[PDB]
Amino acid sequence: HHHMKVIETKYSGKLEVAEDRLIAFDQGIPAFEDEKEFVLLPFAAGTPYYTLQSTKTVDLAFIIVNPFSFFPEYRVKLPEATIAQLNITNENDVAIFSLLTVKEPFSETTVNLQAPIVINANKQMGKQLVLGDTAYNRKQPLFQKELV
Amino acid sequence: DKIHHHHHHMKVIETKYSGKLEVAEDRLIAFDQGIPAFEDEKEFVLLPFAAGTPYYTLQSTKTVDLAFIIVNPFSFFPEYRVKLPEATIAQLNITNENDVAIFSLLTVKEPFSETTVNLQAPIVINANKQMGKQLVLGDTAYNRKQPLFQKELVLAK
Ligand SMILES: [K+]
Ligand code: NI
């Protein structure tokens, strides 16, 4: 047997998703604290683009990137509390994503490097982690490799 | 047969990256000459990543593993220009420049920053008439392996 769920998505209509892809956000996301479950929808293998889609609110879907594909010097320090919270035990567990603010033209799109999405897919746990002590920019130009 | 409906226009297709999807018949694009090296693939659907972004896949409706990763090249190369010959205009029943969408095939590399785009041979789609082709441009200096990302420093000091 399998465990599949039909999910209404913002950009792709209804998709069938394995249940083990359903990520619990026990604390939701800041300003969306009641949104306790999301699914990661990648664009295409080998690309750094994704959407983080609410499994309960079709119109809530964050366009995100793997920032490490765009910004060579970007690093994320995970606090112990975040590690506990997401049941992380090892480096390979962890996926980092960053929210786009998509602009017209697309070349002006920015990336929030202060507040990454952190997902432990293995344990189906996620959160948005707000970095306080950093000099990262909440509006880093997506197409400027060098950090502001 | 003992159950009637008006849902015959919705087609179920297996996609490379999104699983099984339902697609409206009016999204099915006829490629009457197929695509070069895939001349038997006469029907594709355009699957956009997300509104406001230039990323799409061009998915065969007959062959699950044939899905081209493509971009709107104008989002990356503002000065890009595509000349449709008179015969292409007729082939795709274009009756207005607003009918036309241009896409360019990616060659996705690892790391992604090394990805190239084919600027010599765009995908040309008339969505209103559901007709497409790939057109190899003549008499241009466009690069078939144009870097998608700018890694050079251009000086006009
Ligand atoms: K909810
Ligand atoms: Ni089971």
- CB A53 within 8 Å of CB A60: yes
Distance, in Å, from the CA atom of B20 to the CA atom of B45, rounded to the nearest integer, reads 13
Residues of A in contact with B57 (CB under 8 A): 44
- CB B56 within 8 Å of CB B47: yes
Instruction: Inspect the interface and report whether the beta carbons of A102 and B75 lie closer than 8 Å.
Output: no
Distance, in Å, from the CA atom of A104 to the CA atom of A93, rounded to the nearest integer, reads 35
Residues of B in contact with A43 (CB under 8 A): 17, 49, 55
Ligand located closest to A25 CA: 1
Instruction: Inspect the interface and report whether the beta carbons of B19 and A16 lie closer than 8 Å.
Output: yes
- CB B44 within 8 Å of CB B31: yes
The structural domain count of chain B equals 1
Tokens of B108: 């996705």
Distance A61 CA to ligand 1 centre (A): 13
Provide the shortest C-alpha distance from residue B123 to chain A (in Å): 19
Instruction: Inspect the interface and report whether the beta carbons of B69 and A47 lie closer than 8 Å.
Output: yes
Q: Give chain A's length.
A: 148
Distance, in Å, from the CA atom of A76 to the CA atom of A69, rounded to the nearest integer, reads 14
- CB B121 within 8 Å of CB A59: no
Residues of A in contact with B113 (CB under 8 A): 69-70
Alpha carbon separation from A3 to A12, A20, A140, B22, B40 (Å, rounded): 21, 8, 39, 20, 36
**DSSP β-bridge partners for residue A6:** A16
Residues spanned by the domain of A137: 1-148
Resolution given for this structure, in angstroms: 1.7
Provide the shortest C-alpha distance from residue A102 to chain B (in Å): 7
Tokens of A62: 């964050």
Nearest CA in chain A to B70: A44
What number of CA atoms fall less than 13 Å from residue B49's CA on the CB side? Answer: 26
- CB B13 within 8 Å of CB B29: no
Distance, in Å, from the CA atom of B105 to the CA atom of B124, rounded to the nearest integer, reads 11
Instruction: Inspect the interface and report whether the beta carbons of A102 and B18 lie closer than 8 Å.
Output: no
Tokens of B49: 């990543």
User: Can you give the C-alpha Rg of chain B in angstroms?
Assistant: 17
Of B22, B49, B75, the CB nearest to A105: B75
Whether the link from the prior residue into A141 is cis, omega within 30° of 0, is no
Ligand located closest to A36 CA: 1
User: Domain with B10 in it: what CATH number?
Assistant: 2.30.290.10
Nearest CA in chain B to A8: B21
Distance A121 CA to ligand 2 centre (A): 18
Tokens of A27: 């604390």
Q: Residue A30: which of A135, A128, A122, A110 has the closest Cα? A: A128
DSSP state letters, chain A? ---EEEEEETTTEEEEEEGGGEEE-TT-BTTBTT--EEEEEESSTT--EEEEEESS-TT-EEEEE-GGGT-TT---PPPHHHHHHTT--SGGGEEEEEEEE--SSGGG-EE--SS-EEEEGGGTEEEEPPP-S----TTEETT--S--
- The alpha carbon of residue A25 and the mean position of all alpha carbons in its chain are separated, in whole angstroms, by 11
Distance, in Å, from the CA atom of A98 to the CA atom of A140, rounded to the nearest integer, reads 11
